[PDB]
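Reviewer comment 2.1 asked that we show a complete input and output for one of the modelled complexes. We chose the copper (II) ion case, as it is the one discussed in the main text.
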Amino acid sequence: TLEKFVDALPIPDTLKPVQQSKEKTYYEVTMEECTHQLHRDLPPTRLWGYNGLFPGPTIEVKRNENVYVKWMNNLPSTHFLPIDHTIHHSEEPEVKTVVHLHGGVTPDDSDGYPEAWFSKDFEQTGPYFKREVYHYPNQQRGAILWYHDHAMALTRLNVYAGLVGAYIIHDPKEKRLKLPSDEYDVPLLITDRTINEDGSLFYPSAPENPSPSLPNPSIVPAFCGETILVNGKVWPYLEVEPRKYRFRVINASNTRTYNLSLDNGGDFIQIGSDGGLLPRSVKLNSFSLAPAERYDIIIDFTAYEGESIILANSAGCGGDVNPETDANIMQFRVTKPLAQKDESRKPKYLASYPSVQHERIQNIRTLKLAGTQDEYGRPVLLLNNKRWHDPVTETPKVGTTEIWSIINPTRGTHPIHLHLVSFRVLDRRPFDIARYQESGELSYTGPAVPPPPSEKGWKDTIQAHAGEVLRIAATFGPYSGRYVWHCAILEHEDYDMMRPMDITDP
Ligand SMILES: [Cu+2]
Ligand SMILES: [Cu+2]
Ligand SMILES: [Cu+2]
Ligand SMILES: [Cu+2]
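Response of the prediction step:
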């Protein structure tokens, strides 16, 4: 297996507009079969990429920039990854695609609804499709967003194939904080993969111990890659200057949760969560990062000139972490000479607090993380006992604020994500699990615990741990329409831990 730290980290180019005016910015991105080398010692890999790139081009926008992206499909009619035709019921094309701007404050027909998919040149289109050219008005806080495929029953596959990319919102009012910028502001999209000797992607076509019950192919409830990539390279190194850098850390992995640290025991400074700048910077030695979460951090290399510091990982996936493989993410080498004085800062005071506003509670939704079992013996994961196709039940009123109480009686954590909104985190609290499943009755086995400082700002994707109740608060708006919410573990999302979320007007 593969030598760590032999390839330089790619930094995806910033996409140039096809057309741009003071009034609007117009982009085109076309999904393409392409080939790229993921490691010095691998034959080139066949992948699917936005504009033929893996990752996709980084998109950079200003707050309130009036942006249009025409997302196009120029992919083969047949997939190269194992499709399990038994998981959702229809004839439709095999390959369907739709692009979701994760974290985007987006009108509903531009949010990438799972059933607004389209095939090559939009020849066929799912029943919720309305438009070719998506509109992102970016009337939101500066933040790290990312874009990826969201097609019904295909998300885990189309993302694994390479359909991911970063999208950054710059709010000019933050410039005065003098945070590291430009070359010193670098996205890190982390994706675990398993790669065959011939260089092709491997994604499992059935679980461990294929019971000869199951279909072929069969969806699996979890995927753990043998290798870790950052920005499309296996275990890369990045040469940095001895100074402060900002990194936009994005977990673009299907299932895997990371728990990140530096091997010299040095510290990160977190300045931002999914929803933007935290009110105050937080010094951390480590942090958890589940699928779809984003951490905006500063790493201060000033005193570590000449050193090699590994970005390490302690969280296992399907087993204890292996020191020689998945315990490693990437390696910094502090050997780039300074291009100029480091005029960047690491302030304490970042932004006005979340409860700067008084909201009033319209509704309290109690939501259970559960899971029946299917025809073939496989676990099916469900939000509050509903399938995706059942009539909508999460129906908040535009303009109003709800508390959502997520109850997780399962043995694992679920990163729950809501489209459109970001939200504050209130608390987590433990409970009698056997009692909850035996009777449907909820008894707390300890006090409510507030979030850690990492989670005191704005979030859109949030870890709900086993045996706990998580409470979040969201004001739903500013758009009304048809959106979704789901577990961000893609293997779960596709079967069937995803439900519609209607935000109503009258
Ligand atoms: Cu999203
Ligand atoms: Cu997503
Ligand atoms: Cu899940
Ligand atoms: Cu989603």
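The domain at 171-351 is CATH 2.60.40.420 (Immunoglobulin-like). We note this here for comparison with the apo prediction described in Section 3.2.
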